[PDB]
Every structure is written in structure tokens, then in C-alpha cells.
Symmetry: C3
């Protein structure tokens, strides 16, 4: 009925396990597209698994690092780590590559891409609120924490590459921002302003509208390419 009542239910959907699985699937799919990733999974399977954990949990690793917490604190969530490990195994080692074939099917892939953006926006907002809890007026800390929560492994791409034996120092995601990195920066500014009370909008409405923006952009970008 009411618009705000729909936004409250949208902003409170349980991300675990379905929306988190979509996040893991899309992120590990990107890993498999990277040069040498399939070869690495055969010769260095542990390093391949660690690369996938970076793609799945890099948001929490970077946020915890920025806030001076254990960078692997999120790995105490055993069910999430196991679910992400199952996604890595199925994408790289499923007989007949069947899991890859099913999730790469474009109608299914676009749904996973949309569900991942639901998770990203929730992570941005949680980063801002978590930083605010520790620093009531730490505007720059709120923005940094929300930014790495949304960008994820992209901001540590130079060292994700290093783990794979690759070194390309001529570029990085700060010097040249991809769209998700730049959109996460815009997002963390909006949620920080909403935390300041400067932006006259409820947190649920901002989550709903910014998620729709991300869904439309990413789905369009994915379908086009």
C-alpha cells in the first residue's frame, strides 16, 4: 500500500543465504574470467580459494582494516565462508562445468547481478552506520568505511593480482575508478548525508531508490556486454 511500507520490507530482506549466494556467484564468476584463473585453480587450488574469499569478503576485510579490527573477523561466520567455498568449488570444478553453464545463462545471470546490488547497497549503509557508532561526527571515517564496503575487492585489486603472481602498478581503482567503485563513492556520500540528518529522506527510502539505480545500471551494463 504505502511507499514507505514497501521500502521497509525491501530494506530488511534477509540477505543470507540467497542474496549472499548471488553475491558470491557473480563475484567468483568475475574471478574465473581473470587471466590464468582456471590454470591457477588446477596448479594452486589453495591460492585460488583464497582469491575467491577475497572476492566474496573483501568488503569486510577492508572495512575491518580501516577501523582497526581483525581483517579476518568476518571469517568467524562459518556458514557464509562454507557457502562461498561451495560456490568456488562448483564454478571451477563442477563435472561437465554444469554449474557455470547454469549461472552464466543470461536470464539467470541478470537476476544474480541484480541480487548482488541489493547486497552491495546494504553493505554501504551498514559501513556508514558502523563507523558512525564509533565516531558520532567522523564524517570522513563514515565515508571511507561505506566506500570500501561497496567497492569490495576492487580497491585491493593490485594485491589480488599479486596473490595471482601478477603485478601491474601503472593503474589502480583509485587512480582510475570503475563504475562500481565510483557509484559506491556516490552511495557512501548519500548515506553519510542521511546519517548527518542533512539529507531529508528516510534510510529505507534511500536504500530502495539507490538499490534500484544500481540494479538498473548493472543489469543494463551486463546485458549489453
Amino acid at each position: 500500500l504505502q511507499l514507505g511500507e514497501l521500502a521497509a520490507a525491501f530494506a530488511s530482506v534477509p540477505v543470507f543465504p540467497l542474496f549472499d549466494a548471488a553475491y558470491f556467484i557473480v563475484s567468483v564468476l568475475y574471478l574465473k574470467y581473470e587471466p590464468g584463473a582456471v590454470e591457477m585453480s588446477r596448479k594452486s587450488p589453495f591460492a585460488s580459494w583464497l582469491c575467491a574469499m577475497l572476492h566474496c569478503f573483501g568488503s569486510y576485510i577492508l572495512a575491518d582494516l580501516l577501523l582497526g579490527e581483525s581483517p579476518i573477523h568476518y571469517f568467524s561466520n562459518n556458514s557464509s565462508v562454507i557457502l562461498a567455498t561451495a560456490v568456488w568449488y562448483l564454478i571451477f570444478f563442477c563435472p561437465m562445468n554444469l554449474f557455470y553453464k547454469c549461472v552464466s545463462f543470461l536470464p539467470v545471470k541478470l537476476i544474480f547481478v541484480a541480487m548482488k546490488e541489493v547486497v552491495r547497497v546494504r553493505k554501504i549503509a551498514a559501513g556508514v552506520h558502523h563507523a558512525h557508532h564509533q565516531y558520532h561526527h567522523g564524517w570522513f571515517i563514515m565515508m571511507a568505511t561505506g566506500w570500501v564496503k561497496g567497492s569490495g575487492v576492487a580497491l585491493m585489486s593490485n594485491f589480488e593480482q599479486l596473490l595471482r603472481g601478477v603485478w601491474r602498478p601503472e593503474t589502480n581503482e583509485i587512480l582510475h575508478m570503475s563504475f562500481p567503485t565510483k557509484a559506491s563513492l556516490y552511495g557512501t556520500v548519500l548515506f553519510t548525508l542521511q546519517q548527518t540528518h542533512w539529507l531529508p529522506v528516510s534510510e529505507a527510502n534511500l536504500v530502495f531508490f539507490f538499490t534500484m539505480f544500481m540494479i538498473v545500471c548493472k543489469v543494463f551494463m551486463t546485458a549489453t556486454h
Copy 2:
């Protein structure tokens, strides 16, 4: 009148905002001299701003990292971050480059250089005292913390370069120490010995005399080159 009475007033001058501004101005001037820095400020303005934040607050980032605190804890000091951002903007984007012209004027630049050394020595001593508060007998932790507080961005120069898209691994400030890095190492040893009670001198007198040493050296080095 008394020498110790003058040292107490010298060692307690409010560094914010005037002495901190001089620190920011000199540090961002060095950034602008680095290869590709002006080009970077045009094409990648956010990364340019982040580079300037490293030059202005790298001392606190490194000390917080060494002590297991949030590496961006100092960015909760909104007024300092805003003042440093204003210095970055004026140095790189002032119409007619006027701010750069005024602060690069040698009589004015030597004053800024001298005021920066006041801030550096205070930061070294604060690092030693802060580490001591957490480790009453942690001599090596006191020396490490005082050292990075004084050296600043120099000790993370390899990764300041990486942010700019530069990689020169054949050298670093530990393998080949510049004068400020080496002088900060001598300084943190002196303040640690003063904390041990081994060195028979008041903390205010050591601040006054070591600051004068730094002022004379840096001013002379700056004027000469």
C-alpha cells in the same frame, strides 16, 4: 627570564591551526614537485587529494597502524582534514597559481619550513609518550612509534608512489634514509631515553633544543637548494 620557563612556553604552543597549516603547505608543496603530480590533479583529482592526505597525516596513519589502532583514526578531526584539503585545493587549483606563488616565495617558504619542524618534533615526542602509556617498558615500541610520527609519508613512499601509478622497488627510505628520516630516528632515541629517565634533561628542554637543531638544518638545506 628563566631558560626553562621559555622552553615550557615553546613546547606548549598551539600547533592548530597555524603550525599545522605550515606543515600541510610544505608537505603539499613537495607533492606538487613530484613527477606527474599536476597532471594527476587534473585527470584523477580524488587520488590527488588522497595523496595529499597521506603527506599531511601519514605520521598518524603509520603510528596507528603500528599500535593496532584504526589507521584513519585521525581523520575524525574534521577541522584538520578540512584545513589540509583547503591547502591542497589552493596549491593545485588557485586561479593564476597565486597561492603557490605566495608560499613558494623563499622568505615565506623558510618560515613555513621552520614551523613544520616545530610540528615534527612535537609529533615525535607524542609518539614516544603514547607508546609508553600502552607499554611502560616497551622501549622498541616507543622508538618505532616516535620514528614514524617524525618521518611521516617518507616511510610509506613506495606505496605513495603506487597510488600515483609508480613502482620503484629498488630503493626505500629504510634501505636509504633521507636526512629527515635519519634525524627522526635520532630524535625518537633521545625522547625515549628521556622517557627512561636515563637522559638527565626535562622534556621541554629536549623539545626546544632538538627543534632548534631541526629548524637550523632544514632551513639551511632549503635555502641552499
Copy 3:
């Protein structure tokens, strides 16, 4: 008399200072074998000393980093740092290179190598127990912490090389595990399972048997090469 009574005394031998000294000696010997290490000790003695501190305490640096503690927390143990510094000085600067000659004598070197493995296994188990204390069910955190405690400087070899002015990004100890790195991974899994209560064996018996495995392997590998 009883087997478990012998294991309790074996698993509780005081590692400081004799077993720790053997750890430092073997680790600094490996440092001296690295390319340019003797030259570095002459031209950059401070950086050489820091490299040796990484080889002696890298286990604690990495574990503290993973758990969000001060990475130099272990350097508050002044006696250990001083003992490690004495080993570095004697190995690189002893007149007539006499200390190197005595500890490189194969019968003596094999004893030091065996005593180092006693220290490594104790460090693995302590890492698992320390992580468990903070995360009662953090299986993945227990395994990560035990792993870096056992592997030591090997897992940060790329940045130990960087400190020396070397950059070889085409390989790392995760992508290509050496035997001690792989054995420490097996060890931390066993001690984690023993913490889970899944593995029906006492902690003292596991320490005794896994140490013997490491002693036999490393001594054999050292003697052979």
C-alpha cells in the same frame, strides 16, 4: 615411565632462551644466505637488522595483524629482541666470522634446526589456542592464525624482499608453498581439529608427535642439502 608423562614434559620445555636462540640462529643464517645480504649489512645496517627482526618475529607480526592487534606487540619483550639482535650482530659482524663458523658446523647446525622445530610447533598450537580464546567457534580464524605462526616470514617474503630492494611478484609462498609453509598448514589443521574435540588425542601428544615429524623432516632436508 608413561608416554603421556613424557609428552607433558616435552610440550612444556621453556623455549626461552635456548630454544628461541636456536630459532633466531637458524633464521638469521637463512637471511645471510639471501642475495646481497652481507653487502646490505655493510651499507644499510639498520635495514639489515630490521630484516633479521622479520625473520625472528614474523610469526608474531603476522598473527597480530590477522587478529587486529599491534603488529609490533611482541617487541615489548625486550629480552627476546635483544637476544635476536645479538644473534644478528654475531652472524654478520663477528671478528673472523667465528660465530658463523661454529653454528654452521653441520653437527651443531642440525641441533639448532631440530630445536627450531620445537619452537615452530609450539607457536602453531599457541596461535590456534589464542584465536580460539577470542572466537570459540572461529575455525577459519584458528587455522589462519596457527598457519602464520608456523610459517613466519615466508608468508610475507614478497615484502621482506621489498625491504631489501628486491621485487619478484611472479611467485609467492601461497601460490607456491615451500615444505615448511605446507607443513604448517597441515599442522594448524590438526591442532584446530584437536581444539574442536574432533580429533581424539591430547594436546601434549599431538605436540610431541608433530614436532618429531618436523624434526625428522627438517634435519633430513638440512643434512641432504
